[PDB]
């Protein structure tokens, strides 16, 4: 559909059978979730935001459903204040910014 | 336009007669620019996200052109890593998220 930006663009996602709220975030290169357990191999990464840098774990080829859309891709996990769907998965689901 | 998210959504802005580049950020409540001199009264504020908080200056009723569309609103100024157009002004220029 079409999502207004008068309020934060929060949507339900589903990952590993858990329901979570995340923010559709054109200002994020990547998808970053609050601390959680995921299966398999991972690698540590440092990402930057508004106030400095945080450490995350990078997991690849994780299935995630984002407002009804099946996606499979990389998920970074760490101390983000809010779950973020970044450009890597917005593109996957066909999301554009229109004005 | 309908902007795709293959690349960071960096666009032309014009503020106080200066040409800059800014990131259209649906993950930001408010607009924050790198340090610059703007006219008029300001108030200090803190804004936060990944990596913690920074101290900014808040100016009101500032004209800014974003990708050709005129806006007038509240502009924060401070140590952000990139000029950021937030929802406050994305709404003004008619932005929605579409998928």
């Amino acid at each position: 559909p079409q999502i207004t930006l008068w309020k934060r663009p929060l949507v339900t996602i589903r990952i590993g059978g858990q329901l979570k709220e995340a923010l559709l975030n054109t200002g994020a290169d990547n998808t970053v979730l609050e601390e959680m357990n995921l299966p398999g191999k991972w690698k540590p990464k440092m990402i930057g935001g508004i106030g400095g840098f945080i450490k995350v774990r990078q997991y690849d080829q994780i299935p995630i459903e984002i407002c009804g859309h099946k996606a499979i891709g990389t998920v970074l996990v760490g101390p983000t204040p809010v779950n973020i769907i970044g450009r890597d998965l917005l593109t996957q689901i066909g999301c554009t910014l229109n004005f | 336009p309908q902007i795709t998210l293959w690349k960071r959504p960096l666009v032309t802005i014009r503020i106080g007669g200066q040409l800059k580049e800014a990131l259209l950020n649906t993950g930001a409540d408010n607009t924050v620019l790198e340090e610059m001199n703007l006219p008029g009264k300001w108030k200090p504020k803190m804004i936060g996200g990944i990596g913690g908080f920074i101290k900014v200056r808040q100016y009101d009723q500032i004209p800014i052109e974003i990708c050709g569309h005129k806006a007038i609103g509240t502009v924060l100024v401070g140590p952000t890593p990139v000029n950021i157009i937030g929802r406050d002004l994305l709404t003004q220029i008619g932005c929605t998220l579409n998928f």
Binding site: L23, N25, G27, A28, D29, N30, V32, K45, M46, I47, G48, G49, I50, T80, P81, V82, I84, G86 | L23, N25, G27, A28, D29, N30, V32, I47, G48, G49, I50, F53, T80, P81, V82, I84, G86
Partner: peptide
């Protein structure tokens, strides 16, 4: 609450 979720890849 924080309000600016800029995020840059590694």
């Amino acid at each position: 609450r924080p309000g600016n979720f800029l995020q840059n890849r590694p």
